[PDB]
Amino acid sequence: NDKEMRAAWISTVYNLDWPKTKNNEAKQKKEYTDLLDKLKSVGINTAVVQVRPKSDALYKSNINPWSEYLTGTQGKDPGYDPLPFLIEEAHKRGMEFHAWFNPYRITMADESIDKLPANHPAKKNPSWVVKHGNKYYYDPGLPEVRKYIVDSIAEVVQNYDIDGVHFDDYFYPGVSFNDTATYQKYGKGQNKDNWRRENVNTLLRDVKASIKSIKPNVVFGVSPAGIWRNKSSDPTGSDTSGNESYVGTYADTRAWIKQGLIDYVVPQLYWPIGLKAADYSKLVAWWANEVKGTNVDLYIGQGIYKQGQSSYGGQNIAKEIVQQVTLNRKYSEIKGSMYFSAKDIANSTSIQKDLKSLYS
């Protein structure tokens, strides 16, 4: 058992949630504690903080360079290690802390691979690197890549009092990923798509095992995209027609659940109730079902960033959050929620009011 999960994602990429200010220890800290206070005032009991937004570290590592989002320049030492502060301030307020990693990302759109610092693992191991479109990734199919990611996670589990380790929804960036050489070396001739899915499964499985061998009671969870497979691809799938995690991304969430490769799962149900392509009410039911008779905790990823902007087709989730969570609580298999993202709680008094009424 446990109390209802009420988490907020605190994203560090492009300084989305924290920190707003660069090159200012005192202000970064105050911005974090101000943010935590806001989240705690509405019932948030867990902070899920992106400590590796981009093959980098918001912490002192012997493996991964300092994150550019602290100072503007990757590899630049900010003069303090943020992570202990971020954990200890969360714990002081009675909140759990999950460290959030992006495993395969190296660059964002259109950045140069030659502007990485010399000790960057992708600089030191160029054979690990795959270009897809306007971005570069670590190859999920290389054993050495998976070891490096396991070792990167293990360092944090060893050195810090985290409660959880968390991956979000980025696995493979598309079907056309140029892993031919790696497939030839390790794929045993298997169907390439299944091979890719199992590369992802293998990473999750090695990470869980590494976590447990250091700290048995630290949890491991993943927030994949809200659709695994549509009914049209697999009749046991969901009555939906959106994008499927099973094939773009090769995030085979069912298999993760069936084999207990994770302690919790957080499908991103970032759509309104009654939306034809991805109806929230249908997906909560489907996912409640997926975890029946397992020990995997299900949390719903809540898309409160959608507040009626034309960018998202006028979809307004924030407006119906009370309805969404009230529906969640009708399923005993659902053990709480994760809100994308913390800035939306911070910046909107109506969201605050609505969360307070759910969590008082």
Side-chain angles (χ1 to χ4, degrees), residues 206-278:
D206 293 355
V207 169
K208 201 191 154 98
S210 164
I211 291 164
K212 300 325 193 170
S213 82
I214 299 158
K215 286 174 184 167
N217 308 347
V218 168
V219 294
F220 178 48
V222 182
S223 180
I227 300 174
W228 164 73
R229 297 190 91 186
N230 301 135
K231 186 149 281 180
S232 49
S233 298
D234 184 329
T236 67
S238 49
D239 184 31
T240 52
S241 63
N243 220 59
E244 301 174 299
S245 83
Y246 184 82
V247 54
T249 307
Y250 308 100
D252 187 355
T253 318
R254 176 169 288 174
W256 308 342
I257 297 154
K258 156 152 283 221
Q259 305 170 44
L261 307 187
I262 63 201
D263 293 299
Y264 73 85
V265 70
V266 193
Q268 294 179 7
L269 305 194
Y270 302 164
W271 301 281
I273 285 167
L275 181 75
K276 189 134 66 215

Side-chain angles (χ1 to χ4, degrees), residues 288-300:
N289 195 61
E290 281 301 293
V291 308
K292 264 187 201 91
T294 81
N295 295 311
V296 178
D297 302 329
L298 166 64
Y299 310 133
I300 304 314

Side-chain angles (χ1 to χ4, degrees), residues 81-319:
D81 183 353
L83 192 51
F85 179 85
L86 301 175
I87 290 154
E88 288 160 10
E89 288 305 322
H91 287 163
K92 277 192 263 176
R93 294 162 178 79
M95 304 171 77
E96 304 270 78
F97 182 96
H98 292 204
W100 161 23
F101 297 81
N102 187 300
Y104 311 113
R105 174 192 279 156
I106 303 175
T107 62
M108 304 306 277
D110 299 303
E111 297 174 355
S112 174
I113 197 76
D114 277 283
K115 268 198 169 185
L116 301 184
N119 69 324
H120 197 291
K123 262 273 175 75
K124 298 215 291 147
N125 304 281
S127 49
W128 300 356
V129 172
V130 173
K131 200 179 185 209
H132 182 277
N134 61 350
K135 282 191 284 297
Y136 289 92
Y137 304 76
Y138 296 112
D139 193 347
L142 288 170
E144 290 199 321
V145 167
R146 293 191 292 271
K147 189 171 133 49
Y148 151 71
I149 296 170
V150 165
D151 289 354
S152 301
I153 275 62
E155 188 181 45
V156 177
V157 171
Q158 197 81 60
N159 297 350
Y160 303 93
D161 201 44
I162 61 158
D163 305 296
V165 176
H166 179 99
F167 286 6
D168 70 317
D169 58 293
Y170 297 101
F171 297 89
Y172 283 85
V175 72
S176 83
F177 203 64
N178 180 11
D179 54 0
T180 302
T182 308
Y183 171 71
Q184 276 175 216
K185 196 153 160 48
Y186 304 102
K188 303 293 192 182
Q190 180 177 28
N191 173 285
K192 193 129 66 78
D193 291 347
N194 294 348
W195 175 68
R196 287 175 176 170
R197 284 183 274 278
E198 181 59 31
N199 290 333
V200 173
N201 298 354
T202 298
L203 179 65
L204 301 188
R205 197 245 281 125
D206 293 355
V207 169
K208 201 191 154 98
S210 164
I211 291 164
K212 300 325 193 170
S213 82
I214 299 158
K215 286 174 184 167
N217 308 347
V218 168
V219 294
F220 178 48
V222 182
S223 180
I227 300 174
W228 164 73
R229 297 190 91 186
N230 301 135
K231 186 149 281 180
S232 49
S233 298
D234 184 329
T236 67
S238 49
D239 184 31
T240 52
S241 63
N243 220 59
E244 301 174 299
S245 83
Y246 184 82
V247 54
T249 307
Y250 308 100
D252 187 355
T253 318
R254 176 169 288 174
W256 308 342
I257 297 154
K258 156 152 283 221
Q259 305 170 44
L261 307 187
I262 63 201
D263 293 299
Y264 73 85
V265 70
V266 193
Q268 294 179 7
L269 305 194
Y270 302 164
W271 301 281
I273 285 167
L275 181 75
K276 189 134 66 215
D279 184 351
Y280 185 90
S281 51
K282 285 178 181 170
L283 284 153
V284 291
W286 191 82
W287 286 108
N289 195 61
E290 281 301 293
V291 308
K292 264 187 201 91
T294 81
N295 295 311
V296 178
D297 302 329
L298 166 64
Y299 310 133
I300 304 314
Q302 313 288 172
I304 62 164
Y305 75 98
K306 300 196 174 177
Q307 296 163 27
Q309 304 90 318
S310 16
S311 337
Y312 309 123
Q315 284 167 41
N316 195 333
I317 293 161
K319 170 71 179 169

